[PDB]
Each structure stands twice: as structure tokens, then as C-alpha cells.
Amino acid sequence: NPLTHSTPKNFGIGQAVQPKRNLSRYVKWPEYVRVQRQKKILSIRLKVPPTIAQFQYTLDRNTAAETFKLFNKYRPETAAEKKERLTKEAAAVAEGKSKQDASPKPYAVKYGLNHVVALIENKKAKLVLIANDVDPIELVVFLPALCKKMGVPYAIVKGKARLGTLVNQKTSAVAALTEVRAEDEAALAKLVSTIDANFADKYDEVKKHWGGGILGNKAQAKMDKRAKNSDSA
């Protein structure tokens, strides 16, 4: 009020140098950024075959979190827990004369790609988890079809790295369960039901549907409003 004044500015083309604004939409990115974005786009623009694109249909965050919840009880031995187990059965077995068992039959999530494949082939898998990222996609893509044929209930899940954490690796392509402690059997059957309902049942129909063929929005609104006026005046 007192000696203070209201100036204000005219930003109106031909006066008053423009204020600093957010140009983030316009910044010129490094090529490696430019590509990983354009790669994402090109995959959406193209028509994508049903044997791929049966991915992108991914387990919902709820059913998944319940699935991780169960799986996380089954983690493999930590480095310490094996060193620990050994000294137990290094002593007790070699002396107390139990034959190679001072240790209980372990129950753990099964992993590694070649490991899991032969498990599915051998019908030993109760549940197979498949990641959605897996850049050389071929390592994985045959798995739903393999599972479907072997009558092994499977799910496509987000987090190749989140599958990793539960096995104590940076990443894992797959995670599977074969054995389960009798205490957890019913929770599993419940998970298997919801999962089979979202994947193994829908397999045949999904197999018929191509994906992609999706426009960007500048192209979208152009044809949304062009087909809008042309037909209905």
C-alpha cells in the first residue's frame, strides 16, 4: 500500500520479455532417452500379434500382493542360514550318525528359467509366475502356451525385479511353487483359482486378439472430431 505500487506486466506479444515458464515438454533430450521413449511408442503404433500382447494383460495389484505375501514365506536359504545349517549337519550327521539328515526337507520357491521349464514339463509346478518385462521376450513367451498344455496354472506378473527380490537376486525371469507346507495349501488353492480365472481360462480367446494399432493423441483428436462432424452435422 504505502510507497508500494501495482505495476503489472503485459506478456502480450511485442512487450515485456516472457517470464520463465516450464519448458519440460519442449526440452531436447539425450538420444538414449529419445529412443527408449520412441521404442515404447513404435510398439504401440504397430499391430502386435496375439502370442506377444497376451502379455500387457497383467495381474491386478491386489491378487498379486496376496501372491507375493504367500511366496515370501517360501524364500530360499540366505547365505548365513546355509552356513549355519551345514555346521549343524556337519557335526550331527558325521557324528550322531543320522544319514544325511540333521536337516528337515526344505520348502522354497523354485527359480531360474531352465529350472522352471523342466518343472512345468514334468508337471511338478503348482504355480508359475512370469514377468512382464524380459527384453529378449523369447525367453518367456512360450511359457503360457507351455503351461496351458501342461495344465500348470500360471500368471503374468509385473516386477521381474520384484520376482527377483523374493528370491534374493537382482532380478528373476520366473518364480514357481511346487511343494507347499500343509498349513498354506488352502491359501494357494484360492490364489490358483483367481489366477486361472484371469489367465489360463482366457488363454484361447486372448490368442485370437491382436494388440496395438493405437494412435497418439494429436492424431486421435484429429480423427475423433473428423468422424464427429462428417457423419453427424
Binding site: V35, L42, P136
Partner: protein
Amino acid sequence: GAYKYLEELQRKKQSDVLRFLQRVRVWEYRQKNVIHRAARPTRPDKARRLGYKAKQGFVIYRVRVRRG
């Protein structure tokens, strides 16, 4: 194991699933430098039977050459 499946799939080049893959990948490569380091094999079964190993000291490079 998985490698056997990769082998057979890769023998269908004109199959719709590989035609897609071929088309997307060939664009990406052509965007990068004519010689550029590859993080991992994109044919793990092929590398494998040519003597590749996942231990430290093995390296993959990707490269472009003109045709004709």
C-alpha cells in the same frame, strides 16, 4: 530347459510373432551407433552354442555393415 525352445522359435522368421520383433528391433539398432556395446545377447541360445558364457570377461558387441 528354455534354450531348446528359443532355438526352434528362431527358425520361424516369417512367423507373425518374429516379423513383429524383427521390425521393432531393427529400427532401434539403426538408431544407435554403427558399433555399440550390447548389454546382453539378444539371442542367448545362439551365443550359448557359439561359446558364450555368463562369466565376467565375455563381451557382446553389435554392429552394422552396408549391403550389396
